Amino acid sequence: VVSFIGSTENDVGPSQGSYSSTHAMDNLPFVYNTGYNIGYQNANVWRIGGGFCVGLDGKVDLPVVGSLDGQSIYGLTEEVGLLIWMGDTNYSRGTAMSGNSWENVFSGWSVGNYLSTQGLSVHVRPVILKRNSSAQYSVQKTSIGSIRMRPYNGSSAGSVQTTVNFSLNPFTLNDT
Numbered sequence: 278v279v280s281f282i283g284s285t286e287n288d289v290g291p292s293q294g295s296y297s298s299t300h301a302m303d304n305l306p307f308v309y310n311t312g313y314n315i316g317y318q319n320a321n322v323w324r325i326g327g328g329f330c331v332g333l334d335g336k337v338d339l340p341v342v343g344s345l346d347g348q349s350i351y352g353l354t355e356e357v358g359l360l361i362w363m364g365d366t367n368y369s370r371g372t373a374m375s376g377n378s379w380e381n382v383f384s385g386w387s388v389g390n391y392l393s394t395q396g397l398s399v400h401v402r403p404v405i406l407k408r409n410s411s412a413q414y415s416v417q418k419t420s421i422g423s424i425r426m427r428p429y430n431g432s433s434a435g436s437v438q439t440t441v442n443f444s445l446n447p448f449t450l451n452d453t
């Protein structure tokens with residue numbers, strides 16, 4: 278059994294976050310290592326129980342403008358892009374996203390003869406694609422994509438909500 282207990286619209290990263298780096302940035306694309314700072318995490322989005330089996334699919338809607346180490350660089354503006362990870366609750370379990378199709382981002386688990394929950398997480402890292410004289414780049418709130426629970430091994434969502442969405446909070450990049 279399962280029920281939706283989270284939120285449909287979720288903001289990624291703190292509003293007006295400030296991200297800076299002391300790294301030179303001589304060769305692009307340059308990735309800001311913001312760790313999991315620009316992210317959203319919730320260990321409790323659906324409640325499940327009684328042998329329910331569920332995993333997660335993820336989908337990014339931003340245009341793909343290239344890749345880095347087998348993971349797509351999604352474009353936000355001509356100068357800024359993102360690397361994106363979606364997956365189970367723990368940020369560490371994030372699956373590097375590529376493409377714009379629904380992708381398996383959490384292989385899943387089966388809750389035993391008890392009650393528990395299924396959560397999720399998303400984090401992104403900003404990428405400098407093109408130079409700028411101002412050195413500073415501000416990004417506006419922007420839709421990223423979505424995550425959907427994937428019941429398996431017989432389990433079924435029924436009419437319980439399966440998808441939640443994500444928006445990137447605005448932020449600024451400050452190249453020291």
Ligand SMILES: CC(=O)N[C@@H]1[C@@H](O)[C@H](O[C@@H]2O[C@H](CO)[C@@H](O)[C@H](O)[C@H]2NC(C)=O)[C@@H](CO)O[C@H]1O
Pocket residue numbers: 319320321365366386392393394395396397
């Ligand atoms: C080994 C272990 O702790 N197993 C169960 C946990 O998986 C379970 O936690 C839930 O795991 C899901 C899949 O990893 C997460 O999506 C979900 O957010 C997480 N929920 C919480 C509250 O941490 C816990 C809790 O029911 O029980 C264990 O038996």
